[PDB]
């Protein structure tokens, strides 16, 4: 219960926030894409186990 | 910097952590001991 889905989820929200203040920045946008990929990864990985 | 990176690279190929091997080693020592107690007891019966 530290790396479980929630932990990644709030981290994605955190990256989205940091984008909200630097709207033009390409780097932040790429970072948000990556965080989204990680989030979906955890979702599907747990679903695989079930 | 490149040399440090490749140094750490080499370790991953050839080195091994001590905790893992040590932990396995002690246990397997004990397992061998119980195994031989098997022999001791069967021989002790064997005298019949």
């Amino acid at each position: 219960k530290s790396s479980s889905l929630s932990g990644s989820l709030q981290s994605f929200f955190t990256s989205l926030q940091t984008l909200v203040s630097n709207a033009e920045d390409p780097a932040a946008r790429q970072a948000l894409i990556g965080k989204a990929e990680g989030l979906v990864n955890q979702f599907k990985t747990t679903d695989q186990y079930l | 910097d490149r040399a440090l990176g490749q140094k750490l690279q080499m370790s991953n190929l050839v080195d091994v952590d001590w905790n893992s091997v040590i932990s396995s080693y002690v246990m397997q020592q004990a397992a061998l001991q119980a195994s031989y107690k098997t022999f001791t007891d069967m021989q002790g019966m064997s005298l019949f």
Partner: protein, 49 residues
């Protein structure tokens, strides 16, 4: 159904030590470098900015 043999308790312990080791490595690296952000692993947006 017990792990006296596999230890388990021992393997478990070990993994926690790995977590602590990673924490110590990060702390040492940052404290020696003087920078929180030493590589793209620290942050993406931070690196760029």
């Amino acid at each position: 159904a017990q792990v006296i043999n596999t230890n388990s308790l021992s393997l478990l312990t070990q993994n926690n030590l790995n977590k602590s080791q990673s924490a110590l490595g990060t702390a040492i690296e940052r404290l020696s470098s003087g920078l929180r952000i030493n590589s793209a692993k620290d942050d993406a947006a931070g690196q760029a900015i």
